[PDB]
Structures are given as C-alpha cells and as structure tokens.
Structure 1
Amino acid sequence: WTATSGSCKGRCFELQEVGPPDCRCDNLCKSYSSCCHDFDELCLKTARGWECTKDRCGEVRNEENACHCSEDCLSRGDCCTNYQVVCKGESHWVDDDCEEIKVPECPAGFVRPPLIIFSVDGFRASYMKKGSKVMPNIEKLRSCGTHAPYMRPVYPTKTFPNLYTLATGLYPESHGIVGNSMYDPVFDASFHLRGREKFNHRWWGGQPLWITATKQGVRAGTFFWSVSIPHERRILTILQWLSLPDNERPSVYAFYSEQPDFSGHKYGPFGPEMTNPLREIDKTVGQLMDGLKQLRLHRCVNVIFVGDHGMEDVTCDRTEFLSNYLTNVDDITLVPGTLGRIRAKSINNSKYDPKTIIAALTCKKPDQHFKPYMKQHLPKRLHYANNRRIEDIHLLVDRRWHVARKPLDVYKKCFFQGDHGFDNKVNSMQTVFVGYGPTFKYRTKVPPFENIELYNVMCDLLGLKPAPNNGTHGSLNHLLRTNTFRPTMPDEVSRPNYPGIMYLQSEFDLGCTCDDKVENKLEELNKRLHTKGSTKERHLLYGRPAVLYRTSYDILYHTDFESGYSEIFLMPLWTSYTISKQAEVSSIPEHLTNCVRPDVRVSPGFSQNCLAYKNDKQMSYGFLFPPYLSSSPEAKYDAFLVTNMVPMYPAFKRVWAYFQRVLVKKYASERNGVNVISGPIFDYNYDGLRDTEDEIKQYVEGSSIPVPTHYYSIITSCLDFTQPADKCDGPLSVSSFILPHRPDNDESCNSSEDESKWVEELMKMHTARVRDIEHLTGLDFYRKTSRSYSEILTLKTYLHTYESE
C-alpha cells in the first residue's frame, strides 16, 4: 500500500526518497507505481515542447510549460536548453571553438567540479567513426577531451552487469549482477529486466559510486531512472538540481539512454534505421552542453560519455538448439541467448549428471557455434565463476549466434536483428569512453582499457576514497590533468633465501636418475659465477617479483634462468629467462630423456621426488625453464634439476612442450627477444586469488606435491622492437596467458591434429593481464624498471586480445 493521496507540490524530483505509505516524487517513483496523484501534472509537464522559439522569447511565465523562455528562467533555473541561443543571440556549445580548460571555471559556491555521467546502452565503439557525420556534439567531446578508441565491457556483455560494474569497479561475480536474467538458488528467486524482484537490494553487492559519495559527505542520488520519464525531462532535471543552493546541490549526476541498444536489437548494429537513434542521442548531448553553458558550468563540469556494451548482428536462423544434442532436454533449465547457463530443472534429482551433459555438448557438430564449459574452466580473464548465481555449466556462444533449448522457445517467445552478451574480447561488444572537462586532459588519445577501472577515476574526480574494487588504482592516471592518487608498490612480505651448496648427492633418495657424470679450471669459477648470479641481469630484467604473502622460498640462479623456489609448494612460484632473437632451439638428447637431478642447494625434505610421478599413472611432469632453449649442452643439465620440475598431465604436456619448443622462439624472432616468467597457479576455489596450502584439492599420488590448476607465462619485450628485449630504454610490450591445467584437451576440438593446428589458438583464448596473474599468485612484477609506476600499472592491466581491426 502507498496512500498516493499526498502531493508533489514543491517536491518534483526530490533527491531524498520518502518512506511509505506517504507517496513519492523522486525520479524512481514511477518504477514502484508509488508516485503521488499529481506527479504527471506537476513533475512531467510537456506543454509547448522542449525548445524556445522567437514568439516565446521574454514571454509571461506560464507554469504549465515544459520549460520556459521568460526573463526569469535563468534565476529559476528552468529555461529550455536553447533559451540563450534563441532569445539572447548566443551560440550553441557545438559551434564554439574548443578551448583548453586549464583550470575549473566554476560559479561562486561550487566547492569542486561536478561530475556528470552520460551513459548510453548498446553504443558500439565503431559508432564513433561510422556515425561521426551525424553526431557533432559527441565528436566535439571526443576530439576535444580525452578518449580511448574503445572501452572493454565485462562478461557477460549485458546491460545490468555492465552498468553496475561501471558504478562499483567490481566484476559481476563480486557485485552479484551476473546476468540480465538470474536465478539465485538460496533465494529460490529470479531476477529479470521486467518485474519488481530487481528492486530488492539483496541482489546488489559492492558499494556504488553514489553511496561512496554520500558516506564521505559528497551529495549524490541513485543513477537509476524510471523508463517512462523522457530524456528531455532527465536533462532539465539534472540542470535544475545544478541550480539548487550550495548545501542542497549534488556533486555527481547520471543520465541514462536506452538508445541506441533498443533499435540496435530490432535493426542490427548498422541497420539504416540506426542513423536516427544516433542523431537523437547527439541532440540530447547538445541539450545538456547548451544547458551547462547557460548556467556557466560548461568549463566547470567533468563529463563522462560512456557505453555499457556494443551490438552484434544476430538473427533467429543463427540459433543452435540444445534439443539437437541432448535427448534429455526437459531435465534441464537454460538461460538462453548470446550465452548459455544450464542447471537441473528439478533440484530433487540425484540422477542428474553435469559430466554427461558437457560430454553431449562437446565437439558434437563440425560447425558447432558454442563451446560448453564447467565454470571453473572458463578463461580466467572473464572472472566468471565465483558466485552461487553462476551455473556450473556455461556455454560460450560464438559471435553472431544464439543458443536455445528447443525450437518452440524461439517462435513461441523473427523479431530481432541485433544482440549482445558475447565474450568481452569480441570487437562488436566493445564500447565507448570520452572524458571532457577541467580534470581530464586536452585533445588526448589513451589506449583501450576496461570499464572496471572507471570507478577509481570517478572517485579521484570527486576527492573520494574508493571502496575496495577490481580496478588498479593509478592505471588510468594518464587520463587526468591533475591526479590526487599517487600509487605505491606493495611492500614485499617475504624476503628470499639465497642457499649455497648445502647437500651431498647421496643425501637424496628421490628415485631419480640422470646420465650426467661425464666430468678445466677456466670453466669452473665461471660455472660458480652463474650459480652466484653473474647472468642474472640477462635473465631477470625487471627485478625479482615481490612475494606479497608470508612464505619460505629460495632464489636459485643458473646460467640460463633464475627462479623463486617455494619450500612449501615444492616448486618455483616463478622462473625468469630471456631468449634473444638470435638464440637456438636444440633437442633433449636421447641419454637425458628421463633425466631428473637433485639440487644440492635444496634439502631432500623440500624437494619433489621421481617415485611419486612413477606411482601416479595420471600425472607426469614438465619443466618451467625449457631444456630446448639451453645456451649450451652443459647449461642444459641445469634445466633437469628437480627444482625446475612441475606436475603436468600428459594431455597438458602436448600444450606446454609446443609452447616451449616452438612458440617461445617464434615470439623471440617476431619481437626481437622475449623475457619469459612462467609458473604454477593454484585456484581450487575459483575466486581468482592465490590458494593457501590448505585449499589444495589435488596432490601427486602419495606425495605433498600440490597440482596446479593453471600455468602462467608473462612474455615481455621492448615496445620499440628495433631494440632487443635485453637492451630496451623506453616502454615495454607484454602478453600473458593463464593456461588451464587439464587432464584432457576436450576444450580443443581439433586436438587430435598437430599441435600447430590448435595449441596457439587455445593460448589466445586464455590470454591474460599481468594483473590477473598477480591476484592468482600473490606476486608483484616489474619492480625494477626505468619506467614510471603509473605506466607500469597500465602495463599490468594490458590484455592482448588477438582480434582483428
């Protein structure tokens, strides 16, 4: 019950929302069907439209009108946006030359530059160039402010997960809005675009910007708008709020547009019907800028123009149906469309097997336009697993396609020509970012970045301390004229040990064998210099990684590589080596095939053993530094140390051995040397964070040797590839991956073929930011460079995507 028989007189678009059963006049009341009886009359006036005309200039104030052209309107704060243009001979904002905003030029009483978020649904990145002739206000924002060529949304590339990601800096897995449609098994309730369930706070985690603002004494209301309030009224409302007295006036404002997504769905991303929605969004931006100029706020406010996701060509005939794969299709519930999420229809079924379903969906058709995954096996870059609302079975749907359960689901719901929600690396899913105002830089291009980063920037723009989030604070410092956040490197928590030769060969009982005892004083202090770290500047280019948790580990130096050896996990946390453009690939000699050597620097008790691998029929082993890239036959012996060995499934070894033997050399050839840091990752609970010892679910049979869930590599070179990796004076170039450590290659449908047909493609899918690797390892990389820390932060957030142009 709302006793909707109070009034909105003097209360239109009030900022504080009022408690029941007393009726509401806030910008959300229409959503709850709880507005006072007079809201439309008072708060949603439309009379005479949205523009001033000559015949309206200097009129007698008529309170019925949607906006005013009378003399008093400036001081009342409620002119039509074009008032100064029509009735004062002033020019539109878009027609003024763009002048650098060196300092905030605000009216008296403004304590700080207000922030205005202008968000646009389904605004694909390429619209910036492709729609440029019809969007002059937007193009002026772009060229005059700071802009990226695109901004990367989060997966799934749906509206709600992305807008709430913008507001919180959190992955959907952490904020809870994991889809446009969601079932929570605990709530036994469903969240939809339609309906009243979405209004419940229990779905929405994290701390949105407006709450971060309010708690630190910066005024801000919700970013939400009821859909029935037209766009013109939203602009006029924001402009009215901006006219409030200093102690009432909010510091942050948000405008939302359902366009161009709405038409995009009907007409496809580039349908001839798409020109008009783009025109209209530009007009709206123009109204806001004219309005700000009127209030002399146009060189005072910071404006963000930002989209939630792109739009792809998708039609009904491009639907894969699960009923073409499964016979038991009525046993399952599917979240359909541009992604798939499958769960049991009845939770009262103990004869329900996810394994059998995955298998029935795996590589079943040659053309297959989806790939099934257990959620923990999804690419770690998607960060799409750690939430009870995310189904164990996920379908990654190919761009341009849909998944549905049965044909009846499509025809009894062709309506659509456009959709979105695909993998966030997909070009068509990319969206937009423009920043304009005194705090942003002038006429500046920045590289593409992820929408998870914006929360921190908006906090900075408002003098707020950000709530804990998934951005890397400082990675977007290059967007801003004046910063206020100075990032610092996390302190190293564990200092390494530097062990010398401490054990005799006969102290080891590892069950290992090596054909090695084929024994000059010239070449003998030289070998000792390598174990002491003479070649360390060659192979460790950016300093040792800092271990950011409490542990026991040893630095181990060799001719060809250096490692950080964990006495707890019985393997390296990292292994660092440099392969120049000129270096040679050799083989593992016949006599050294099964060679594993005790490391006289590390105790029997802190070493792996060969017996464990013999007894484990599933588990083989591989090496972190590759023997194939030894600099000399004699240095090759170092690669076979027990301290360089890691557990590997035979199926995974196909992947690793091809990466090591072929790809590292290919990257060194193409990039003029590479530095490689490789290591294990443990993430049994799939939270995207380093597991502690007692979270490990699998060991090599009969041992304390823990089994990695993933293997990483960070591959760094000089951005200017005319300089070799090991002599590089300026910025760096990086690509990384996090390969899942799996006992089969079911993920790669062509894996029965030569590694050269499938291995590289898999690695590409599992591309990663260094930052992802840091969370997963508790390591901190690039500690010693000639580069600024902000630049290094940007580098750590880079993701090599592998998409075309």
Structure 2
Amino acid sequence: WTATSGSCKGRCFELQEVGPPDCRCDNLCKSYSSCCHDFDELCLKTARGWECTKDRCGEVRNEENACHCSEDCLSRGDCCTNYQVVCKGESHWVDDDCEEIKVPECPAGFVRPPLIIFSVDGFRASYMKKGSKVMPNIEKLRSCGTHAPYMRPVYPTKTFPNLYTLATGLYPESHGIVGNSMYDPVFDASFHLRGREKFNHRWWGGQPLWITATKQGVRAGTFFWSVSIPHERRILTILQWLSLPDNERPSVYAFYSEQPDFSGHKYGPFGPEMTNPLREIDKTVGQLMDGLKQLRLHRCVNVIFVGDHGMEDVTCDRTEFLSNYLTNVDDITLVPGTLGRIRAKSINNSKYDPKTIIAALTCKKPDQHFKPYMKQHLPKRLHYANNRRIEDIHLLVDRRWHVARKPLDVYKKCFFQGDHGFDNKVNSMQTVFVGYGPTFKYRTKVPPFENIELYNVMCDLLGLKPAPNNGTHGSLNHLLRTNTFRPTMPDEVSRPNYPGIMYLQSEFDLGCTCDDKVENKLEELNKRLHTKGSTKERHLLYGRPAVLYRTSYDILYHTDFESGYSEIFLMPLWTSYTISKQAEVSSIPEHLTNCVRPDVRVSPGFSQNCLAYKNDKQMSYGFLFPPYLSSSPEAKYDAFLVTNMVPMYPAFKRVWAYFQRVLVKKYASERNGVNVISGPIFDYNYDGLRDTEDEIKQYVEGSSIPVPTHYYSIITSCLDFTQPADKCDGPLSVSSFILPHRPDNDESCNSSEDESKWVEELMKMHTARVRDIEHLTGLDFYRKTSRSYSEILTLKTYLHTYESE
C-alpha cells in the first residue's frame, strides 16, 4: 500500500528514501508504483523542451518550464544545459581545444573532485572507433582523457551481473547476481528483470559503491533511474544536485542509458538503425559537459564513461534445441538464450540424472553450437560456479547462437537481431572505458583490463577504503595522475627447508625401478654445485614464489629446474625452469621409459610410491619438469625423480605430453626463450581458492597421494622479444593456463585426432591470469624483479585472450 495523497512540493528527486506507505519523490518511485500524486506535474516538467533559444534569453522565470533561460537560472542551478552558449556567447564544451587538467579547478567549498559515472548499456567496444564520426563529445573524452581499447565484462555478459560487478568489484558468483533470471533453491524464490522479487535485499550481496561511500561519510546521488524519466531530466537532476549547499551535496553520481542495448537487440550491433542511438548518447554527454562547464565544474569533476557488455549478431534461426538431443526434455528446466542452465523440473523426480543429460548433450552433432559442462569443469577464468543459484549443468553457447528447450519457445515468446551473454573473452562482448578529469591521466591509452578492477579505482577517486573484492588494488594505478594505491607485497608465511642428501637408496621401498646404474672428480663437484643451486639464477628468474599459508615444504635444486616440494601434498607446489630459444627437444630414452628414482634429499615417508600407480587402474603419472627438455643426457636423470612426479589420468597425459614436448619449445622459439612455472591445483569445492588437505576428495588408490583438479603453467618472457627471457632489462610478457585434470577428453570433440589438431585449442579455452593461479595455490609470484610493484600487479591480472583484432 502507498498513501499517494502526500506531495512532492520541494521534494523532487529527494535523496533520502521515505518508507511506505508514505509516498515517494525519488528517482525510483515510478518503479515501485509509489510516487506522490503530483510527481509528474512538479518533478517531470517538459514544457518548452530542453534547450534555450534566442527569444528565451533573459525571459521572466516561468516555473512550469522543463529548464530555464532567465537571468536567475545560474544561481538557481536549473538553466538549460545550452544556456550560456545561446544567451551568453559561450562555446559548447566539445568545441574547446583540450587542455591538460593538471590540478582540480573546483569552486570554493568543494572538499573533493566529484565523480560522475556515465554508464551505457550494450555499448560494444568497437563503437568507439566505428562510431567516432558521430560521437564528437565521447571522442573528445576518449582522446583527451585516459582510455582503454576495450574493457572485459564478467561472465555471463548480461546486464544485471555486469552492472552489479561494476558497483561491487565482485564476481557474480560472489555478489549473487549470476544472471538476469535466477532461481534460489534455499529461498525457493525466482529473480526476474520484470516484477518485484528483484527489490528484495536478500538477492544482493557484497557492498556497492553508494553504500561504501555513505558508510564512510561521502554522500551519494541515487544511482538508479526509472526507465520513463527522459535522459535530459536525468542530466538536469544531476546538475541540480551539484548546486546543493556543500553540506548537502553528493560527491558521487551515476547516469544510466538503456541505449544502445535497446536498439542493438532489435537491429544487430551494426544495423544502420544504430547510428541514431549513438548520436543521441553523444548528445547527452554534450549536455552533461556543457552543464558542468556552466557550473565551472568541467575541470573539477572526474567522469567515467563505461559500458556493461557488448552486442553480437544473433537471430532466431541460429537456435539449437534441446528437444533434438534429450528424450526426457519435459523433465528439465532450462534457463535459455546465449547461455544455458539446466536443472530438474521436479525435485520429486528420482529418475533425473545429470550424467545422462551431459552425455546426451556431448559432441552429438558435427557442427554443434554449444558445449555442456558440469559447472566445476567450466574454465576457471569465468569464476562461475561457487553459488547455489548457478545450476550444476551449464551450456556454453557459441557466439552468434542461442540454445532453447523446444522450438515452440522461440516463436510463442523472428524479431531480434542482436544479443549478448556469451563467454566474456569473445570480442563482440567487450565494452568501453574512458576516464576524464583531474585525477585521470591526460591523453593516455592503457591496456585492456577487467571490469572487476573498477570499484577499487572509484573508491580511490573518492578517498574511500574499498570493501573486500576481486579487483587487485593497485593494478590500475597507471590510469591515475594522483590518489594511487601503493600496496606492499604480502608477507611470506612459510619458509622453506633446503634439504641436503639425507637418505640411502635402500631406505626406500616405493616399488619403483630405474636403469640408472651406469657410472669422475672433475664433473662430480659440478653435479654437487647444481644440487646446491648453482644454476638457480637461470631457472628461477623472478625470485622464489612466496607461500602465503602455513605448510611444510622443501626447495629442491637441479641442473635444469628448481622446485618447491610439499611434504603434505607429496608433490611440488611449483616447478620453475627456463628454456632458451636455442634449446633442443629430445626423447625419453628407451631404457628410461618406466624410470622413477628415489630422491635422497626427501624421506621415504614424504615421497610418492610407484606401487600406488601400479594398483590404481585409472591413474597414471607425469612429470612437472619435462624430461624432453633436459639440457644433457646426464641431467635428464633428474627429471625422473619421484619428487618431480605428479598423478595424471592417461587422457590428460595426452594433453600434458604435447604441451611439454611440442608447445614449450614452440613458445621459446617465438618469444625468444620462456620461463615456465608449472604445478598442481586442488579446488574440489570450486570456490576459486586453494583447498586445505581435508577438502581433497580423491587420492591415488590406496595411498595419501592427492589428485589435482587442475594443472597450471605460467609462461613468462621479455616484452621486448629482442632480449632473451633470461636477460630481460624491462617489462615482462606472460600467458598462463589452468587445465582441468579430467579422466576423458570429452570436452574436445576432435580428440580422436592428433594432438596438433585439438590440444592448443583446449589450452586457449583455459587461459588464465597469474592472479587466478595465486588464489588457487596460495602462492605469490614475481617477488624479485626490477619492476614497480603496481606494474607487476597489472601483469598478474593480464589474460592472454587469443582473439584477433
């Protein structure tokens, strides 16, 4: 109930929300059907439109008008945005040369530069270049301020997940808005874009920027705008709030535009109808900047122009139907479209089985345009599994396609030509970032970055401490002139042991054998030096990784590689080695095929054993440092140490062996040497974080050898590829992956073919940031470089995407 009989007189776009049944006058009252009776009349004036004209200049104030052109309007803070241009001979902001804003130039009484976030729904990154001729105001913001060529959204690339990620710094699995549509089984409630459930606070986790601000004494404008409030009125409201007395005036504001997304769905991302929506958005930006210039705020305010996601060509005819695959399609519920989420239609149906649904959906049609995954098998870069609102069965849909349950769903709902939601690495899903103002840099291009990083920067711009989030604070310091955040590296928690030779061969009863009984003072001292770390400078190029949790581990040195060996997990946490451009690949000699050698530095009690692998019919083993890249026949024996062995399903060994034998050398050839760090990951609860030992669900049969859920590699070289990886003077270049450790290659439909036709495609899908691997391992990399720490944080957030231009 709303007592709509109260009044909005002197309350128009009030900032404090009043509680029911008292009527509302705020920018969301329309969405709740709760505005006072006179809200349209008083607050949504439209008379005489949005622009001053020559005859209006100096007019007598008529309170009925949408905006004013009378002499008093500047002191009232309610002139039309073009008032000074039409009536006082001023220029439009867009026509002024740009001039560096070295310091904020703010009116008296301003405690800090205000922040205005101008958000545009569906604004595809390539519109910045492709539409630049029809967007002069946006082009000026972009060329004069700080811009990225694109900004990566979060998955799914849908509106509500991305807008709430922008607001919180969190992945959707953590903030809880995991789609535009959701079912929460604990609440037994459904979230939809239409209707009222979405206003219930139980959906919304984390702490959004407007709450962070308010908690820390920084006042915020209300960020949300009811769809029917015209853009011109949104801009005029912001400008009016900026004229409030110092003690009442907010420091942070948001504008939102439903365009170009709205037209993009109807016409496709580049439909000829798209030019007009782009011109109109640019005109709104112009109104804001002219309005700021009139208030003497255009060299005081930081403006962010940012999108939520892009837009792809998608039509009804490119729809896959689950009814062409499943016999039991009436027993499932599908969340459809550019991603699929499947659960049982009825919790009383004990015939429901996810294993048979996945199998029926796997590689069934030659050109199949979606791939099914249990959510824990999704690429870890998507961070899309740790929430009960995310169904166990996920369909990753090819760009340009939809999935639906039955054909009747698609024509009892062709209309549309655009959609979004796909994998957030897809080029058409990328969106925009521009920052303009005193705190941003001048005429500066920055590399693409993820939208999870922006909350921290918005907090920096307002002097706020961010709530705990998934950004890496400091990784965007290169966007900022001042207000940088200068973090310290985390402290190492566990220090390593450096074991020497402590065990005789006969103390081991591991059931392993090796033909290494073939027998020099000159060269004996040399092998001892390698075991003491004499080659460590070559193979450990950026310092040893720091272990950020409590554990017992040993550093082990060898001619060709260094490792940090965990006595708890019975295998390395990390293995580090450098392969020069000139390195040669060799085979595993015949007499060493089944060779595994006790490591006399490490107790039998803290070693793997070969008998366990013999007995475990499903499990084999591989090596972290590859025997194929040994520097000499003699050094190759080190690669067969039991302390370099890790459990690997035979199907996974196909992938790993091809990476080690073929791809590493390929990368060294192309990048002028590479440093590689490889290791295991255990994430049995799919929370993106390192498992403790009591979370491990699978062991090699009969043993305490834990089975990794994933294997990672971090591959680093010199950004200036004219310098070899091991003699690099300047910035670094990285690519990394987190490969799922699966007992089949069902994910790769072409896996019966030679590995040259499918393995690298698999690896690209599972590309990762170093920071993703840090979370999953409790390790901290790049501890000892010559580079600034913020530069290193940016490098740790890099994702190599393998998308073209």
TM-score (norm 2): 1.00
Offset at 1:188?
1.3
CA distance in 1, matches of 2:682, 2:257: 42
Structure 2 counterpart of 1:763: 763
Shift of 1:327: 1.3
Decide which moves more: 140-149 or 321-330: 321-330
How much does 1:19 deviate?
1.1
Given that residues 619 and 650 in structure 2 are in contact (C-alpha distance below 8 angstroms), is that contact kept between their aligned partners in structure 1? yes
Separation of aligned partners in 1, 2:35 and 2:111: 33
Between 1:214-223 and 1:85-94, the stretch displaced more is 214-223
Displacement of 1:222 after TM fit?
3.7
Give secondary structure in 1 for the equivalent of 2:647.
Answer: strand
1:225, distance to aligned residue in structure 2 (A): 1.2
- 1:476-513 per-residue CA deviation (whole Å, 9 max, x = no partner) reads 00000013411110000000000000001111110000
Q: Is the 8 A contact 2:512 2:609 kept in 1?
A: yes
| C-alpha distance 484-722 of structure 1, shift in aligned 2 (>3 A) | closer
Post-superposition CA distance 1:703-761 (Å, at most 9, x none) = 10000000000000000001000010000000000000000000000000100000000
Distance across 1 between alignment mates of 2:141 and 2:735 = 32
Tell me the equivalent position of 1:345. Answer: 345
The Cα offsets for residues 511-532 of structure 1, whole Å up to 9 and x where unpaired, read as: 0000001011010010000000
Q: Which residue of 1 aligns with 2:90?
A: 90
Per-residue CA deviations over 1:536-570 (Å, capped at 9, x if unaligned) read 00000000000000000000000000000000000
Please report how far the alpha carbon of residue 380 of structure 1 lies from its aligned counterpart in structure 2 after TM superposition.
0.1
CA deviations 1:83-127 (Å, max 9, x no partner) are 000010000000000000000000000000000000000000000
Q: Who is 1:394 aligned against? A: 394
Q: For 1:427 and 1:615, locate their aligned partners in 2 and report how far apart those are by CA, in whole Å.
A: 47
| Secondary structure of the structure 1 residue equivalent to 2:686 | coil
Query: 3-state SS of the aligned residue for 1:524?
Result: helix
1:14-41 per-residue CA deviation (whole Å, 9 max, x = no partner) reads: 0000011111111111110001000000
Unaligned runs of 5+ in 2: none
Cα distance in 2, alignment partners of residues 750 and 100 from structure 1: 55
Deviations 1:351-406 (A, max 9, x none): 10000000000000001000000000000000000000000000000000000000
Q: Output the CA distance in 2 between the equivalents of 1:172 and 1:404.
A: 23
Distance in 1, Cα, partners of 2:442 & 2:221: 29
CA distance in 2: counterparts of 1:405 and 1:202, whole angstroms: 29
Tell me the alpha carbon deviations over residues 561-598 of structure 1, each in whole angstroms, 9 at most, x when there is no partner.
00000000000000000000000000011110010000
| Equivalent residue number for residue 176 of structure 2 | 176
In 1, the alpha carbon distance for the partners of 2:350 and 2:229 equals 49
Q: Any idea what the Cα deviations from partners look like across 1:454-492, whole Å, max 9, x if unmatched?
A: 000000000000000000000000000013411110000
Contact 2:339 / 2:422 at 8 angstroms: preserved in 1?
A: yes
Deviations along 1:115-156, one digit per CA (max 9) or x if unpaired, are 000000000000000001000000000000000000000000
> SS of the residue aligned with 1:113?
coil
Distance 1:221 1:13 in 2: 10
- In 2, the alpha carbon distance for the partners of 1:760 and 1:164 equals 34
Q: Secondary structure at the match of 2:330?
A: coil
- 1:191-215: CA deviation from partner (whole Å, max 9, x where unpaired): 1111111111111100000000000
Per-residue CA deviation, residues 409-447 of structure 1 (Å, 9 max, x unaligned), is 000000100000000000000000000000000000000
Which whole-Å deviations, capped at 9, do the CAs of 1:754-804 have from their partners, x for residues lacking one?
Answer: 000000000000000000000000000000001100100000000000001
Question: Partner of 2:726: helix, strand, or coil?
Answer: coil
Looking at structure 1, the residues matched to 796 and 222 of structure 2 have their Cα atoms a distance apart, in angstroms, of 32
CA distance in structure 2 between the partners assigned to 1:109 and 1:256 by the alignment: 28
Residues 27 and 222, structure 2, Cα contact 8 Å, conserved in 1? no
CA distance in 2, matches of 1:213, 1:542: 38
Distance 2:264 2:187 in 1: 33
Q: Equivalent residue for 1:22? A: 22
CA distance in 1, matches of 2:167, 2:50: 30
- Counterpart-to-counterpart distance in 2, 1:409 and 1:488: 54
SS of the residue aligned with 1:654? helix
Residue by residue, what CA displacement relative to the aligned partner does 1:321-354 show, whole Å, maximum 9, x if unpaired?
1101111110111000000001101011111000
Give me the whole-angstrom Cα distance separating, in 2, the residues matched to 1:619 and 1:223: 54
SS at match of 1:726: helix
Query: Matches of 1:223 and 1:550 in 2, distance apart?
Result: 43
Partner of 1:330, secondary structure, is helix
CA distance in 2, matches of 1:376, 1:318: 27
SS in 2 for 1:174: helix
Contact 2:477–2:484 (Cα < 8 Å) also in 1? no
SS in 1 for 2:559: coil
Q: Distance in 2 between matches of 1:231 and 1:601?
A: 71
Question: Which segments of structure 1 move beyond 4 Å, counting only runs of 4 or more?
Answer: none
1:186, distance to aligned residue in structure 2 (A): 1.2
Residue of structure 2 equivalent to 1:753 = 753
Query: By how many angstroms is 1:245 displaced?
Result: 0.4
How far apart, CA to CA, are the structure 2 residues paired with 1:19 and 1:193?
23
Q: For the residues of structure 2 that align with 1:313 and 1:296, how far apart are their CA atoms?
A: 43
CA distance in 1, matches of 2:695, 2:109: 55
8 Å contact from structure 2 (residues 474, 484) kept in 1: no
Rounded to whole Å, the distance in 1 between the matches of 2:449 and 2:53 is 43
Task: Write the distance in 2 (CA, Å) between the matches of 1:415 and 1:308.
Answer: 23
How far apart are residue 158 of structure 1 and its match? 0.3
Note the C-alpha offset of 1:233. 0.5
- The separation in 2 between residues aligned to 1:685 and 1:48, in whole angstroms, is 61
How many residue pairs get aligned? The number is: 805
- Distance in 1 of aligned mates of 2:373 and 2:243: 53
